[PDB]
Amino acid sequence: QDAIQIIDENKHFNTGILDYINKTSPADVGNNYHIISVFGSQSTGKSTLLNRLFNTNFDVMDELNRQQTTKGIWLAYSPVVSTTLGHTTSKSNILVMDVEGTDGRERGEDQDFERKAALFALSTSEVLIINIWETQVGLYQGANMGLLKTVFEVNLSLFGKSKLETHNDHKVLLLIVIRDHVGVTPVESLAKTFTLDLQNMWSSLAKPAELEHLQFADFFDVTFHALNHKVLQPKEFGEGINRLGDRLVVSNELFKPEYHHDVPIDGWTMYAERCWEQIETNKDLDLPTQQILVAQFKCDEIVESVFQEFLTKYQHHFKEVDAAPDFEELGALFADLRQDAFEDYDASASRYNKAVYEQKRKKLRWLINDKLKEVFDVHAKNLCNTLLEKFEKDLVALKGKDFAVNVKTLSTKLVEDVNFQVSLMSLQGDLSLDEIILALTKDIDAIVAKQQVVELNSIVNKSVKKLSASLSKSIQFELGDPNEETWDNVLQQFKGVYEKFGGDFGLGTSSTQNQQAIEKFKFKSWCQFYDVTHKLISREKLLALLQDRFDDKFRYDENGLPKLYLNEQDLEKTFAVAKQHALQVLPILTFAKLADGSEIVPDYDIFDSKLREQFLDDEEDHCFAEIITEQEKLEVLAKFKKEVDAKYIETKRSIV
Amino acid sequence: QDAIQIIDENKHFNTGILDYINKTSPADVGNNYHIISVFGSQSTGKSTLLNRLFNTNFDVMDELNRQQTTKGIWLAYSPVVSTTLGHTTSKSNILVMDVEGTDGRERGEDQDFERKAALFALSTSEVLIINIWETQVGLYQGANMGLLKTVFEVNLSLFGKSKLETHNDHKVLLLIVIRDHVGVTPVESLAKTFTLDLQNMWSSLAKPAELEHLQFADFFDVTFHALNHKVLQPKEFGEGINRLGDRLVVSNELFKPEYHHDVPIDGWTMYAERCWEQIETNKDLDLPTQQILVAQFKCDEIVESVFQEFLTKYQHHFKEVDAAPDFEELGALFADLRQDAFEDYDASASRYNKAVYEQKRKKLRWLINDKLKEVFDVHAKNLCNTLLEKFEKDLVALKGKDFAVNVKTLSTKLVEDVNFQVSLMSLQGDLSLDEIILALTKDIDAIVAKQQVVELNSIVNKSVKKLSASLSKSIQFELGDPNEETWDNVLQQFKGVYEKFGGDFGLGTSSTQNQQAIEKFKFKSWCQFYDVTHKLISREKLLALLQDRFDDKFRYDENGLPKLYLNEQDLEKTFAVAKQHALQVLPILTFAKLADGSEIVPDYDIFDSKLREQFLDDEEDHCFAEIITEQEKLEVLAKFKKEVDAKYIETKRSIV
Ligand SMILES: Nc1nc2c(ncn2[C@@H]2O[C@H](COP(=O)(O)OP(=O)(O)O)[C@@H](O)[C@H]2O)c(=O)[nH]1
Ligand SMILES: Nc1nc2c(ncn2[C@@H]2O[C@H](COP(=O)(O)OP(=O)(O)O)[C@@H](O)[C@H]2O)c(=O)[nH]1
Ligand code: ALF
Ligand code: ALF
Numbered sequence A, B: 001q002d003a004i005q006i007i008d009e010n011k012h013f014n015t016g017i018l019d020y021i022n023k024t025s026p027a028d029v030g031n032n033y034h035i036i037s038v039f040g041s042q043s044t045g046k047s048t049l050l051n052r053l054f055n056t057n058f059d060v061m062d063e064l065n066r067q068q069t070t071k072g073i074w075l076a077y078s079p080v081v082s083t084t085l086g087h088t089t090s091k092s093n094i095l096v097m098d099v100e101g102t103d104g105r106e107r108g109e110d111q112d113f114e115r116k117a118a119l120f121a122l123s124t125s126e127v128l129i130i131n132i133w134e135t136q137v138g139l140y141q142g143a144n145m146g147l148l149k150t151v152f153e154v155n156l157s158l159f160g161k162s163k164l165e166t167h168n169d170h171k172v173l174l175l176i177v178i179r180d181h182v183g184v185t186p187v188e189s190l191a192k193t194f195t196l197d198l199q200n201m202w203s204s205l206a207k208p209a210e211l212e213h214l215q216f217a218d219f220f221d222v223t224f225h226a227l228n229h230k231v232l233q234p235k236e237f238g239e240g241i242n243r244l245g246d247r248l249v250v251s252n253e254l255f256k257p258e259y260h261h262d263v264p265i266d267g268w269t270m271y272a273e274r275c276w277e278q279i280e281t282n283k284d285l286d287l288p289t290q291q292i293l294v295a296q297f298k299c300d301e302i303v304e305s306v307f308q309e310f311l312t313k314y315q316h317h318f319k320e321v322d323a324a325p326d327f328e329e330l331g332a333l334f335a336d337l338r339q340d341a342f343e344d345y346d347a348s349a350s351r352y353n354k355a356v357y358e359q360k361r362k363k364l365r366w367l368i369n370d371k372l373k374e375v376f377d378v379h380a381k382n383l384c385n386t387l388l389e390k391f392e393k394d395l396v397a398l399k400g401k402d403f404a405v406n407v408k409t410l411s412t413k414l415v416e417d418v419n420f421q422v423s424l425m426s427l428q429g430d431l432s433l434d435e436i437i438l439a440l441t442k443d444i445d446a447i448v449a450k451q452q453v454v455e456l457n458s459i460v461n462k463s464v465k466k467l468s469a470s471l472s473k474s475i476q477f478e479l480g481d482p483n484e485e486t487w488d489n490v491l492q493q494f495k496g497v498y499e500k501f502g503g504d505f506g507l508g509t510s511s512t513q514n515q516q517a518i519e520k521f522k523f524k525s526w527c528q529f530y531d532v533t534h535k536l537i538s539r540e541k542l543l544a545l546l547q548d549r550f551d552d553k554f555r556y557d558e559n560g561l562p563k564l565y566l567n568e569q570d571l572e573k574t575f576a577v578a579k580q581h582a583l584q585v586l587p588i589l590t591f592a593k594l595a596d597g598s599e600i601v602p603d604y605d606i607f608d609s610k611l612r613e614q615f616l617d618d619e620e621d622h623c624f625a626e627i628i629t630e631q632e633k634l635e636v637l638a639k640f641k642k643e644v645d646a647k648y649i650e651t652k653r654s655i656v
């Protein structure tokens, strides 16, 4: 005898519904039942019409004040159906859903709930009474055509899916009853119009492409019933209701099987809760008020115009890439441009929703940040490259002078000097330095690691020259007395500093390249060694070597005097001193040796052009220590006795 | 007897209005007139109510079909006013504006016109009848509360401006007549509600901050009049109208002076056209349908979710900066990510307005382009720096070998090689190469213009060494015969190749640095010249110089023989040959000269440390050509006769 709210004001679907339903009619409800519901604008007399036509007891508006009355959705079982025969029980149990009216002013702006309940109803009912005033007929929003477009649409997008499966589907009947009908305009005429309005709604909706072909008739039947002014024509109203009672129970011309999705009642109670879950929070159904939606557009409109006012005003400071830059002149010109647009946007948008206005302010800020960044970046990089040059220069300008320790301060100062010089033009850190600083650091590391190769190949080189100096010289100084211990004093130096190489180096290392800083150095000694030999001693300076010795006793006495000859005994006794004094270093220097009499071999397989350019030959190895060739060797002693003896009897003329 | 449309359906304000108005009442209309208009939902019986209450002849809907009837806005002069005394002429001329009803279905979606005409009316009238059905009272959009919020708002934002100027302003009367009033609910009750609804509308509007303080009462009076069912209560309707006739003409309780903005009628005809201009196209009034506004939101919602689906799926390919890059592997992974989001966006947004959907597709594309660009850029630059290294290397690796002509092909190939290698990863040119290519070119130009300085300071250097070789050597070779023409053969070479310097160079020039490639070169000769002199001839190798000559005749004969002495006449005749043969080149070489006997001066003011480091001294100039000093000069001839004569009588011991 009392109804219940299947779904209360705040969207709570009800738990005790099945229980309730079965406790109303003591009959077993099995698949013997109809679901009928009502939809329309606030206070169109719906709770009244259910009450009067089924015989329910939904509250109705007390007429003292026009106000919302039905809240949420309600369900009651119809005892009897008022018909022209008076009251009449029906075969089936008739379950009637009273749904809160649309477009009330209590909830003016959040049409949240109306859309939702309108779709439960539509989704869950065999027959839906669309309850309108005649005077809503040619209306658009006043006939709820907006609300409807939505509701149907989601209905298709959310359960026009189930089908091609041949129920007993939900075709639902759209039972459209016209209230306060005067008669002046024929219902058949009202009907034409409003079905047209519904056909149009149908073409107007978003359709998932699988269903794009689907029509309104496929999903829905429509019929009509007019009802006279209840207050001013009480009787004609009453008869009109009864006439409608006969329509559904007596003639049984309304309900058909197709509406009834054909399962026991518990199946429905379930299908409902389900249907309500999928409705209560649906993405296509979530909507912000008109106001927000309006503010959004309003605010973009401005974003663009203020921005367009930002653009061709910046196409004018920066078409020209500045000649004479200043990062405090710039970060200011920047702040100022951003200041203009804001205050102009603000002048026209602070009216609207603060949040939308705010959301849309931030959007503009970063539209103009990203146009300011472009310029910031340009200069900022123009700066790096300049500085960097100086820095590269700076490195070179201190050859090897304590590398690692100068790398440090210098590289620091760069990074620091950029950070500051460029932070002045970034607008409260709005425009980022991170990517710039990273790209700088990488650049520094690229440079040092190339200045390092230049200092590490310089130390190799400028070490091979304090070697070549002390080396090719303490050859000669040694050579003014060819001893048992020349080589004993020669490689004792050749390798006395062929190690200290050169001490550590102080550059940043490369350890396994610090180490291979030497295997060029050590290869190049074993390359210049041979080259000094093949240059100090050759066919040319060898023939020459004879006389440097030759004269010291064949033309000189006992104390540095040019020998005073005595007999041709003294003339032909000091002639043979030289024949040896011009043969007696060759065993110290034919093929070059060591105080051990064993051959000298090179550290590396040179004479081969493959190990060669890693640091920039006949049959065997045109041998390393082969200073004087195949013969060239004895081509000196074909001349030993030609020139030297063109002096022995050729200077005999001076005893006469 | 016929009205006219001040503004037709499509917004054309009418030209012949003043003329029309004056031709209606033969009375002179001067400031003796009222402006009264009607506002409300389609077919609320407005044209009917004007007709019945003033006695006009606006068409009315023929009841065969519910449809729009009044189109645009109309104006007619009221002959008489129906009142309870029957018909009554009034003192003032009453000008009545019939405005097309809101919310018709003929124009369902474009509320353009209704907003506009609703605001003309409100802006232009002393009294505005808001004509509603009782059954619209507790409604929101069905009571037009949306349309209104707008209309008032713009009204404030567009002419609540004029004021603080103390007219006779437009307070306008809001004359709200309730149609088909049954009586069940007291008009006073309806009134309370609906004025409340209007107060709320008032708090709900955008207000320019100057006016934020302004209230609804400041701008507007409201009163009410109920009217019974015209068809079902013809008489009570009639009496109700008459009762309203008495209200404005008999009691004269409606019109007040404050509504009347107090100027002659032509002033009004003007104020109207003006008001209509500022309305017909106003920015706050320009609006897109609900549908678009809805699609916009709908489509952003998706943009974000599809994008968020793009982001943390890319935070996953690129958190890790790739180790092993491939630009065809990449431009593909890119296209594919962009492919996913699209087809997912498309799967959910192709429903809505194509244009909004399209607009909003493009928006997503470039959201993801700009996230793809970041990665494209990274690698793309990783590529430039690698290549560049090779290129820098490549330049150096061809010392001077035809610079300009190798600069060309090499620099081309780089640019080309980048363009191609990086175009493969840009997505149909969506992501730009322009800024990359520019930054490359600048980089190339930075490098060559530094390799050039290295090749141009090398040619200076390695030219000063084929000079120093032929130079310090054809000194000595010349010096084996100190002639009248030594210097004649010495600077003839010193400046024989101190010009060809060195021929053109073939590098890219710097012309006025190609030219200053030499004013180092020419300065450094005038620097090494002096250095060779101060090194070949000094205290050391000078004392030495004596004997190189000394021996050739004091110890040698006529053909290369060591002189065979004869008498102590032959012993002390060839002793004085040397005293000169050891003094007779000094006038060829004390201070160094020219075959003219004039001093040699340097090209540059050297000995001064200021012109110095532009290419890396006592009282006068510790003179340029001062090879042997203050004395050092005669410190050789304190020893001339010590060592050389420790040989004349010291080798006299060999005649015994
Ligand atoms: N003019 C008119 N008034 C009605 C009619 N039916 C009911 N009313 C009254 O309209 C008011 C609204 O009724 P209610 O049934 O509570 O409307 P709901 O909110 O749409 O359910 C009540 O005062 C009813 O007495 C009708 O058919 N015509
Ligand atoms: N129920 C009712 N019908 C009316 C009333 N006044 C006029 N009508 C009818 O309503 C229809 C609309 O009239 P019209 O005056 O052309 O309306 P408008 O478009 O708002 O100007 C006409 O058929 C009128 O006969 C009324 O007060 N109540
Ligand atoms: F007031 Al209602 F449905 F319109 F309860
Ligand atoms: F049909 Al109308 F104003 F509502 F002409």
Ligand SMILES: [Mg+2]
Binding pocket: A043, A046, A047, A048, A059, A060, A061, A069, A070, A101
């Ligand atoms: Mg109700």
Ligand SMILES: [Mg+2]
Binding pocket: B043, B046, B047, B048, B059, B060, B061, B069, B070, B101
């Ligand atoms: Mg009309």
